[PDB]
Amino acid sequence: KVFGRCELAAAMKRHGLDNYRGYSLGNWVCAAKFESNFNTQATNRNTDGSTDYGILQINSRWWCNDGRTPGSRNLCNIPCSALLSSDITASVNCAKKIVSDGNGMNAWVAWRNRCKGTDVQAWIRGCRL
Ligand SMILES: [Cl-]
Ligand SMILES: [Cl-]
Ligand code: NA
Ligand SMILES: [Xe]
Ligand SMILES: [Xe]
Ligand SMILES: [Xe]
């Protein structure tokens, strides 16, 4: 499923991401934009063999199981395919664990390089939330 900008903002807010760990909603929407362009079915193969899944491109190296990432972990205790669902519950719950890991949203390199420090509020402007 490809979410609309404001549609995703609303879904993320309902799931408790707005200001989670101190990160305003705009930060999450901005991260999703550059990680997946709002597409829940987005996937990407990393150089080390791991794969990124979903709207927040969560990696199989530590967070989910895809059965093809040697020596990896599944800290979110979920099959990576769950991160591709039209229902973002799994992605949100796992994202909450990731952002609480110690480095905040810097865990998402795209957020650090393209969202961090910018006017992320623009990503939710005009949205009825
Ligand atoms: Cl594996
Ligand atoms: Cl932080
Ligand atoms: Na894994
Ligand atoms: Xe992929
Ligand atoms: Xe998400
Ligand atoms: Xe909403």
Swiss-Prot record:
Its EC number is 3.2.1.17. InterPro entries: Glyco_hydro_22 (IPR001916), Glyco_hydro_22_CS (IPR019799), Glyco_hydro_22_lys (IPR000974), Lysozyme-like_dom_sf (IPR023346). Disulfide bonds join C6-C127, C30-C115, C64-C80, C76-C94. In the egg white and polymorphonuclear leukocytes. Substrate binds at D101. Keywords: Allergen, Antimicrobial, Bacteriolytic enzyme, Disulfide bond, Glycosidase, Hydrolase, Secreted, Signal. This is Lysozyme C. The lineage of its organism: Eukaryota, Metazoa, Chordata, Craniata, Vertebrata. The gene is LYZ.
